[PDB]
């Protein structure tokens, strides 16, 4: 459990990356933050891409898609994902201080399946997922980072993707 400080945390500009919500698989609703084409080194980088998900209903599925080192040549070679053990570990902003916490201890009753579509549920595989429980007693905000800001290609530097999850109380 590492408490966290990133360098160049706020000497950067914020573009709000909107999520895509897909509904009705078998009465499944899924929120997705996809950074596949948003972290490539850019002339104006490094920038922050923030994808905020607000959830206030049960069994909501959250999916985060992040590019892999080596998926494209030289474009993601220094990409770093925080927490490395996501989605079992998440970031929280207690005080002004970023701290790693276990999600099941942050949301009582939340459970994680160790696989997503027959790949491991880790950012090493490019995707994490978690379904929020039938009841959430207390509101909580946690974060994930898919950081490519330390990557440089030519004079172009990559971006930092941030997913913020705001869980409102539900299940009364």
């Amino acid at each position, epitope marked *: 459990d590492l408490s966290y400080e990133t360098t160049e945390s706020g000497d950067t500009a914020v573009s709000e990356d909107s999520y895509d919500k897909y509904a009705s698989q*078998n*009465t*499944n609703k899924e929120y997705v933050c996809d950074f596949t084409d948003q972290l490539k080194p850019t002339e104006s980088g490094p920038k922050v891409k923030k994808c905020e998900v607000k959830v206030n209903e*049960p*069994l909501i599925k959250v999916k985060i898609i992040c590019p892999l080192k080596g998926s494209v040549e030289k474009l993601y070679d220094n990409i770093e994902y925080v927490p490395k*053990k*996501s*989605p*079992y*570990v998440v970031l929280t902003k207690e005080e002004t201080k970023l701290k790693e916490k276990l999600l099941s201890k942050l949301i009582y*009753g939340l*459970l*994680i*399946s*160790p*696989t997503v579509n*027959e790949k*491991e*549920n*880790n950012f*090493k595989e490019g995707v994490i997922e978690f*379904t929020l*429980p*039938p*009841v959430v007693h207390k509101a909580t905000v946690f974060y994930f980072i898919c950081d490519n800001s330390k990557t440089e290609d030519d004079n172009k530097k990559g971006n930092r993707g941030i997913v913020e999850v705001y869980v409102e109380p539900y299940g009364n």
Partner: single-chain antibody
Amino acid sequence: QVQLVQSGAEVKKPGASVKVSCKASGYTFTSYGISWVRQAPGQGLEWMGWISGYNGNTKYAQKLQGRVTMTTDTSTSTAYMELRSLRSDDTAVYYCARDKYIPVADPFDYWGQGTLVTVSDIVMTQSPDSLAVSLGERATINCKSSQSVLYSSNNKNYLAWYQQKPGQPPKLLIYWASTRESGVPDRFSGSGSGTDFTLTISSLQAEDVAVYYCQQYYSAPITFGQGTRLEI
């Protein structure tokens, strides 16, 4: 206390259908799910599917797709399993087991008594099919998975061990491959990580004569070992 009470035994001719019920009590039905597992006489355990207790969403094993229908009645906290186009090889004891609000997250701690129906992918391999040991001495059962069940994000092996005595549902002994469920005697020890796992029974006792299964809950479909019969 959590209880799952199933409907009585039924006899059906081949080509007919059967619907087994599972009445739950002692917990909030909508906060969990129901998984169905069947066992042909003297054979291993096969996972049939899962149903959400909140919205009735289902996940079926590709084997039974088309034939199996799972439903819930929230007002009565009852789960139903209907199997169509019955064949003679469907003769088995059908079990309901309480699951979590998502499948493939935990093993099965609470089981129904089973319903006998008489009709007129990660592979788990357990090393000894049969084992004979003396009272008070060590028994070892090995379990091999066709791929790793170690989750990198929490460094836990998604492996469980079960004990099934004649005429009874499977009883959960070990989860996370080495953590005993509450009440499980200390002579039961789980070991291993990744793909190779071991169940050890030190100072064997007469009550420990049973069939032992491993189970992975790492990736759907849920799969069990073929079973290790332990005799004296």
